[PDB]
């Protein structure tokens, strides 16, 4: 079980908010789960009993799972290399 | 406005076989970074 609230603060932005309008009928959404977010505990000691706890709340981490294979590049057409040639006059 | 029909509570369902199998498949993977004889437990966080 859980609860639903209308007004939300997504991208918290203390200075603004948004109101959720009602939706007619009923909603039955089906989706997938592709990843999880985990956070380690404190540095108590060298204990084999290690607990992993879900985190979340950071939007930057959400997109890091989809753009981890990409890296922008800057192309420099100019190039220099020795060669045996002479410019005639 | 007014509610038509019975009053229920929203909820969600997940298959037990699929969920446990995924955890059992990922738990072994994480042991490589930390250790082979490492006990793993999962918590649910608190008020935020």
């Amino acid at each position, epitope marked *: 079980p859980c609860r639903i609230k209308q007004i939300i603060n997504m991208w918290q932005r203390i200075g603004q908010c948004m109101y959720a309008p009602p939706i007619q009928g009923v909603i039955r959404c089906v989706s997938n789960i592709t990843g999880l977010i985990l956070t380690r505990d*404190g540095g*108590s*000691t060298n*204990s084999t*009993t290690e607990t992993f*706890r879900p985190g979340g709340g950071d939007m930057r981490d959400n997109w890091r799972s989809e753009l981890y294979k990409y890296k922008v590049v800057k192309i420099e057409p100019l190039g220099v290399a020795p060669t045996r040639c002479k410019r005639r006059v | 406005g007014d509610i038509i029909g019975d009053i229920r509570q929203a909820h969600c369902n997940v298959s037990k076989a699929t969920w446990n199998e995924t955890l059992g498949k990922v738990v072994k993977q994480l042991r490589k970074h930390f250790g082979n004889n490492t006990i793993i437990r999962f918590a649910n*966080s*608190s008020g935020g």
Partner: antibody
């Protein structure tokens, strides 16, 4: 290793404000906090209260909530206990110790610090309350 | 406010003979989405008390190559691999679940 020392009057009189001070060693108050532990002959150990670098919560035993008090002083580098209305079973030993370990993360109450331990205990306080 | 029970109250054991002790509680010691807080303290007469076992099994530091306790709890237990000549004193069981951080009764030890 860091060793603590207890302080306070030796001879005490009944129905007097008992001020017991724990001599905080090199490790300052800003570091790991302390706590007060009560001893009692012929009975099990009893709890007094905790303390923190910034105080605040400072949970104490409900039984003696309205009688005992814990105060801190960064400048004096000492922690004191105020007690009045003594009882017959007050002729016992008082122990002062700290909490070594901590356990927290980014999800537990947003970085809240959890302490669960008792460090090396003190030498104890010997008292003799009588006429 | 909860009362602890220590069993056995009086223990006699020859050196080299492993010994076991138990601590019990009524309310479960499983913290809210956390661990179980319980420690064993040794009260050597004429010496300062020390902490030997942390959490439920974690050994902080020092001598504990001879003390080892585990188990979910309720009726908490502790085990000793071997008894050394410096194992003389009075034991103690402490529970710090939510409110009191109270202690137990104690248990004496006899050497042969």
């Amino acid at each position: 290793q860091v060793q603590l020392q207890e302080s306070g009057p030796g001879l005490l009189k009944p129905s007097e404000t008992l001020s017991l001070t724990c001599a905080v060693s090199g490790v300052s108050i800003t570091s790991y906090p302390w706590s007060w532990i009560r001893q009692s002959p012929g009975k099990g150990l009893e709890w007094i209260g905790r303390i923190f670098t910034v105080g605040g919560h400072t949970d104490l035993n409900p039984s003696l909530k309205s009688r005992v008090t814990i105060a801190r002083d960064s400048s004096r580098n000492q922690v004191s206990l105020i007690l009045r209305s003594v009882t017959a079973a007050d002729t016992a030993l008082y122990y002062c110790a700290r909490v070594p370990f901590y356990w927290n993360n980014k999800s537990w109450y947003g970085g809240a610090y959890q302490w669960y331990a008792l460090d090396s205990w003190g030498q104890g306080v010997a008292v003799t309350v009588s006429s | 406010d909860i009362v602890m029970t220590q069993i056995p109250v009086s223990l006699s054991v020859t050196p080299g003979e492993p010994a076991s002790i138990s601590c019990s509680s009524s309310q479960s010691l499983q913290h809210i989405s956390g661990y179980t807080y319980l420690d064993w303290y040794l009260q050597k007469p004429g010496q300062s008390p020390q902490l030997l076992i942390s959490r439920v099994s974690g050994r902080a530091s020092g001598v504990p190559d001879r003390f080892s306790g585990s188990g979910s709890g309720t009726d908490f237990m502790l085990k000793i691999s071997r008894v050394e000549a410096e194992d003389v004193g009075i034991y103690y069981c402490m529970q710090g679940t939510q409110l009191p951080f109270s202690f137990g009764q104690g248990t004496k030890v006899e050497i042969k």
